[PDB]
Amino acid sequence: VTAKITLKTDKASYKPGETVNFTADKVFNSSLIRYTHLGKVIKEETFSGTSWSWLPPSDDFQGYMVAIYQTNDGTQTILGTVGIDVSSDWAKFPRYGFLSEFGNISESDRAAVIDNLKDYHINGIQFYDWQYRQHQPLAGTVSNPMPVWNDIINREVYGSTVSGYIAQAHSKNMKAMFYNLAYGVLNDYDPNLIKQQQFVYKDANHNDKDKHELGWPFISNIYITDPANTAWQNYLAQKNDDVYKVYDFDGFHIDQLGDRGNVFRYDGTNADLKNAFPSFISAMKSANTNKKLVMNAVNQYGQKEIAGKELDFLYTEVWSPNEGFKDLTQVLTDNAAYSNNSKNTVLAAYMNYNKANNQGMFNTPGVLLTDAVIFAFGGSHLELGEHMLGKEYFPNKNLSMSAELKSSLLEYYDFMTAYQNLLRDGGTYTNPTIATGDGKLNLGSWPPTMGKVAAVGKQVGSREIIHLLNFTNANSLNWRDTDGTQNVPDLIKQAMLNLNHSGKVTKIWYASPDYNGGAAVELSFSQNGEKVNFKVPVLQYWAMIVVE
Ligand SMILES: OC[C@H]1O[C@@H](O)[C@H](O)[C@@H](O)[C@@H]1O
Ligand SMILES: OC[C@H]1O[C@H](O)[C@H](O)[C@@H](O)[C@@H]1O
Ligand SMILES: OC[C@H]1O[C@H](O)[C@H](O)[C@@H](O)[C@@H]1O
Ligand code: NA
Numbered sequence: 001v002t003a004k005i006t007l008k009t010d011k012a013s014y015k016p017g018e019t020v021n022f023t024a025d026k027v028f029n030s031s032l033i034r035y036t037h038l039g040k041v042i043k044e045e046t047f048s049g050t051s052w053s054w055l056p057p058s059d060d061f062q063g064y065m066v067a068i069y070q071t072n073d074g075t076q077t078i079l080g081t082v083g084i085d086v087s088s089d090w091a092k093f094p095r096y097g098f099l100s101e102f103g104n105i106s107e108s109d110r111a112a113v114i115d116n117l118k119d120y121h122i123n124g125i126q127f128y129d130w131q132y133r134q135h136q137p138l139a140g141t142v143s144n145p146m147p148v149w150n151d152i153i154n155r156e157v158y159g160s161t162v163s164g165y166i167a168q169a170h171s172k173n174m175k176a177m178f179y180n181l182a183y184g185v186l187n188d189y190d191p192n193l194i195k196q197q198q199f200v201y202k203d204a205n206h207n208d209k210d211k212h213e214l215g216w217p218f219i220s221n222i223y224i225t226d227p228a229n230t231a232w233q234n235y236l237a238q239k240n241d242d243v244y245k246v247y248d249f250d251g252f253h254i255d256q257l258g259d260r261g262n263v264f265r266y267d268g269t270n271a272d273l274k275n276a277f278p279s280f281i282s283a284m285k286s287a288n289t290n291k292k293l294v295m296n297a298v299n300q301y302g303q304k305e306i307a308g309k310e311l312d313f314l315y316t317e318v319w320s321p322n323e324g325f326k327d328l329t330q331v332l333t334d335n336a337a338y339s340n341n342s343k344n345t346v347l348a349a350y351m352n353y354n355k356a357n358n359q360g361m362f363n364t365p366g367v368l369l370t371d372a373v374i375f376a377f378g379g380s381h382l383e384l385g386e387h388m389l390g391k392e393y394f395p396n397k398n399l400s401m402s403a404e405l406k407s408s409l410l411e412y413y414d415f416m417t418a419y420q421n422l423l424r425d426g427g428t429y430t431n432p433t434i435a436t437g438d439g440k441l442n443l444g445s446w447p448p449t450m451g452k453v454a455a456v457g458k459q460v461g462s463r464e465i466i467h468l469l470n471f472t473n474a475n476s477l478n479w480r481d482t483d484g485t486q487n488v489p490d491l492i493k494q495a496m497l498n499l500n501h502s503g504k505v506t507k508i509w510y511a512s513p514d515y516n517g518g519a520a521v522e523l524s525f526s527q528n529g530e531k532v533n534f535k536v537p538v539l540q541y542w543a544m545i546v547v548e
Helices: 107-119 159-171 230-246 277-287 325-338 364-376 403-418 420-424
Strands: 007-009 020-024 031-037 040-046 051-054 062-071 076-086 096-099 124-127 148-150 156-158 175-181 222-224 251-255 292-298 314-317 345-348 428-430 434-436 453-460 463-470 492-500 508-511 521-523 526-528 531-539 542-547
Touching (some): 007 076, 020 076, 062 403, 062 420, 107 159, 124 159, 156 159, 175 292, 230 277, 251 277, 277 292, 314 325, 325 345, 325 364, 364 403, 364 542, 403 420, 463 531, 521 531
Parallel strands (some): 124 175, 314 345
Antiparallel strands (some): 020 051, 031 040, 062 076, 148 156, 463 542, 508 521, 526 531
């Protein structure tokens, strides 16, 4: 939290040709703003005030880091950094957050929420439990929408807040996705509209409807309909249209309850929900072709089946037995394969889960290690809204983030924005041949081993990337850090590395969210044959080495 300046930009992301407006919280003398692309300086200018603008290069889907340097005795110091995403649309590089509270909140309170998210470069937002009813997400009618409604826990939801947040998210270049289930009905539905033939039953004689039981303070259990059923699809498409004509959501965050076991259609056939979802997705899209769709594969239920459908990117809510770091990276690897490398993924992976049964703090090194793995592997984490997620019920805010975690996490979002081209824009994973030169690092491959630094290589274009992920001081390899026990890694400094690399090396550079706000630092190096050596300045959680 050493950064002398907080450097922010006005929007979350920028379409090609949009102007970037910067704010620094304070100014220093004899300082230079450097604009970098993949470690290359593309622009330098004098740091001349707190507010200034930059027209970035117009090529689409491009991250940059901006770093301010002071000259002191002729040495320099990084003062502050900010990542910048130039994307036309969010789906290539999704940075998904949420919103959870839609009561009478002031415009300036909403602004502070959206602004904070913006500083993490959040590029769209899942609006969780904004809706009236699973089976009728719009309260009232299109011509007469209800200004205030009660949600599934009977709390008050204001139209003006929903509309307002949509407008605020829009002013910051963010997309707004409305939450609903694919197939939810609560007990006040109209039976003349959702007929008996549309439900899923736990037995074969259309006796007992399948249902997710919710106790107090929820108003109803959730009945389940068949996503493939055409009357259902047409019914809900009308509901979505209704919503879209009232609230200017960009699309529908489709949620579900995961594997229901053996369930039946009315007619006694097997409902086989994972093979019903593809049809549902296509029906939703064809009824609203200008609106976005993302669907949650709960613990990967449906994922193979849906990966080639009309989804912006893939999403996976992670549960047991997927609890290891190596299980997180397996979900990312699987989602690549299922989508034949067409779609990146967002992970809903609730940290400090057990601890969040009570008020407390998030365990900073757990949150950072987990995001260092996810972001190093080209994933993305839905974790931030008005607060950070501790539970699948998004409004729960039992755990707070320290000011240290806030700070750090801002630099991690900066890092994964700035270096998105290296992290999740094509290439192939490789196992680098790398060894400590000095004994300072105890080096292994991935998947990780407690006590060792795991090296992960990726060939992106003509670049070789090596990510160092520090498990030296890890006391579990469980991502969730459910009880907040994980350790803070000891710093390792000036660690000599040896790397086999045929092909002349032109430049090696380093960047770490744990060192100089992720600014790129060029390293010295020698090359004898295939043997290259160099020193990394710092490893805490996650360093990235780039060989060109
Ligand atoms: O998704 C990253 C994973 O991708 C696979 O292609 C590689 O073989 C693994 O080594 C790697 O961890
Ligand atoms: O856990 C309670 C949750 O159950 C379901 O996921 C509902 O769709 C959602 O509205 C509610 O928040
Ligand atoms: O991959 C998702 C995309 O699938 C198709 O190309 C749809 O027509 C488009 O609306 C959607 O965004
Ligand atoms: Na974007």
